[PDB]
Amino acid sequence: DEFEMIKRNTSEIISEEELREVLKKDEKSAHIGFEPSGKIHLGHYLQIKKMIDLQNAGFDIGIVLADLQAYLNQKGELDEIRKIGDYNKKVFEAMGLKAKYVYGSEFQLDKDYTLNVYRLALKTTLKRARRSMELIAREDENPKVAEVIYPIMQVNGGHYLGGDVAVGGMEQRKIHMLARELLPKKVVCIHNPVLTGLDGEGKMSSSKGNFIAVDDSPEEIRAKIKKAYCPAGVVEGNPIMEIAKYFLEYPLTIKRPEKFGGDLTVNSYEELESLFKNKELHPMDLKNAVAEELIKILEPIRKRLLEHH
Amino acid sequence: MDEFEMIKRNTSEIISEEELREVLKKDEKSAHIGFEPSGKIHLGHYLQIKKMIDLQNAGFDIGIVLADLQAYLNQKGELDEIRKIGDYNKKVFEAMGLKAKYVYGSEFQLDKDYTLNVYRLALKTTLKRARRSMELIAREDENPKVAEVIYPIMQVNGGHYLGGDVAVGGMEQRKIHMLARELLPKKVVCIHNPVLTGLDGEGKMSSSKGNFIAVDDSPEEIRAKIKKAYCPAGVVEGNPIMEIAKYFLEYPLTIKRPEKFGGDLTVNSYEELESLFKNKELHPMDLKNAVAEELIKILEPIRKRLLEHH
Ligand SMILES: C[Si](C)(C)c1ccc(C[C@H](N)C(=O)O)cc1
């Protein structure tokens, strides 16, 4: 076990029965890959948190700084991508995760890795490949061959790492299903929710400027939350409610003037959810509480990233 | 003879003639072609090898890529099986009299540097472009594979890796070749050979279609295939027998004929043979019989070299 702790705040495990089997082993391993990102935001942190969960549960953690994939996803030049990966590694360690950090290009260009990419290319239809990239592929009016190489590259990555568990965001689930159908060793997949962007108009993303970075200043965090989409009574699609759900600790103390109800103690996110859905808790008061608790959560991350000056 | 005209003869397309002249000014110059290994080597293969000998006769160092990785990506089986067919293809090409550098594509196409550049070209090649370039090359498939769109860029980078001045192939290769001219910094001169018509007259000739004459077909099989072949009187376009006459027969040619039907005709040019056949002067039956016996004699030293171990 540790099963329930691992399942907490994930969208799906494929499959739970297979995960319980993995959890019986003395030795188990789990991996995730991150295309390097110039800013590291709460979407990354949610995933790192889950890797820390797995680590707490006796999993050896592997982190792929997926520079080759970022390159195939048109994020730029390989050496420039790798340097952002270097910075991403420091952020992940500052979040509390000690793990094995590999750059994808350390093994994803070996001849026998490459031969298996082409073997997998013989078994992956263009349709399957294109459909697995719909939520991942950079936007492009003239889609590139690189886009359908990207998923078979990610599948072969998992093949060569040989872990028991693969972790990723829900946008990754079609690539994960492709690896389960194509590979001899079937990996247990754990998928994290994809956070909603701050203006509520889509999914949070490094390229859309609609995120909170883990090293944003408290003042920037307060401004981003203040201006955030947060309809009273509306929980689904609400970025503020999501932050409250996936990062904050409970009981939660929501401070208010006496004229609007005075201070409030919420013992659970579910309790928080009905209060807000009922319109008992106003969006301004929710924002203030989420902002101040989130600043404290991100405080020691930001400090370690800045304490060199 | 003039090197340019010797290279140009019986080709369908040069990209471009002006770049071909500038390459022929150089003392050191190379040409290359790839072949997916094929269980039977046929007249379409022969025509291309004859063009490589032309180029070699004009001072080009020849490279022949036995294209095993590409054949692998194009669903021709496993590499060891493919490579073994490649070994056989190499003997046939030599039995055709082509001394050249023979390479297996896999020898260099899985290198780390090579692979990175494949991925780089994949960023610059659209899916629609890649698929268009493969329309005459891809193995038929109800559910097309990613392998199909990797194939063109594998071929493109292969030429980039070979450093050749000239790239030779059939007309089915011309989209891949124009893609290579767009994407690479050295623009390669492309010499395209015609694709022969099938022996039944319908559609192009193809290993997969079994509508060809193999260079090691027995005389009786050759005569039989030719006797069967589509050959309307006075119909030159799409006439596989007239194609063979034009691309493989040697002139002046002596069409044997009964005296009762005119006697031996000595045609010293394909063009007149065309004009003769055009005006229905020269009958199909008489054309088939001359083409079959000439071709048998053309192909005889090759079949002999290949059957010599027996
Ligand atoms: C530019 Si090259 C010498 C790496 C090259 C050329 C042609 C081929 C094979 C051809 N497409 C076929 O179907 O036989 C392979 C490689």
Numbering used by the authors:
A (entry chain A): 2 to 310
B (entry chain B): 1 to 310
Task: Show the paper's wording.
To make the 1D 1H-NMR method broadly applicable for the investigation of dynamic conformation change in both small proteins and large membrane protein complexes, we report the highly efficient and selective incorporation of TMSiPhe in proteins in Escherichia coli cells. The Key to the success of this method was the identification of a mutant Methanococcus jannaschii tyrosyl-tRNA synthetase (TyrRS) that exhibits high specificity toward 4-trimethylsilyl phenylalanine (TMSiPhe) in E. coli cells. The application of the genetic coding of TMSiPhe and its combination with the 1D 1H-NMR spectrometry for detection of conformational change in a biological system was named as DeSipher method, and is used for specific incorporation of Si into the desired protein. In particular, the low electronegativity of Si led to a uniquely low 1H chemical shift for CH3-Si (typically <0.55 ppm), which could be easily identified from the complicated 1H spectra of macro-biomolecules.
